[PDB]
Amino acid sequence: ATPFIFSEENSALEYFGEMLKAAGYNFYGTERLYSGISGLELEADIFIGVVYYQRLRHMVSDK
Amino acid sequence: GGLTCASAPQGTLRILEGPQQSLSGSPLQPIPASPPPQIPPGLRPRFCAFG
Numbered sequence: 001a002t003p004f005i006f007s008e009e010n011s012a013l014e015y016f017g018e019m020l021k022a023a024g025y026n027f028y029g030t031e032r033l034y035s036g037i038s039g040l041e042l043e044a045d046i047f048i049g050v051v052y053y054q055r056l057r058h059m060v061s062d063k
Numbered sequence: 064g065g066l067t068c069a070s071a072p073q074g075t076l077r078i079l080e081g082p083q084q085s086l087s088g089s090p091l092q093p094i095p096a097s098p099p100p101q102i103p104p105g106l107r108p109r110f111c112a113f114g
Contacts, residue, residue: 010099024108 017027
């Protein structure tokens with residue numbers, strides 16, 4: 001994810017959507033979910049992925 | 064027998080030592096530009112549906 005490595009001509013979304021479509025998923029990164037409460041396939045297909053979360057040092061236990 | 068002022072100098076020479084410029088080649092980088100991130104060949108799907 002180095003800055004300034006992907007231009008307007010070579011886009012990042014194009015690159016990673018091709019990567020995804022090469023794995024059987026869809027270009028735009030949306031997979032369609034079901035509702036865990038009603039059990040029905042939601043009408044909109046959701047955008048899901050893997051992101052890196054940090055946990056901050058500020059906790060309600062200290063404030 | 065003493066020292067007296069003589070005629071004013073007619074000119075001055077100032078010497079300095081200087082080397083010269085080479086040709087402009089402008090060789091910017093060993094491996095140049097920002098080389099683009101790219102597709103691994105073939106890849107293949109690493110996942111299948113159930114059924």
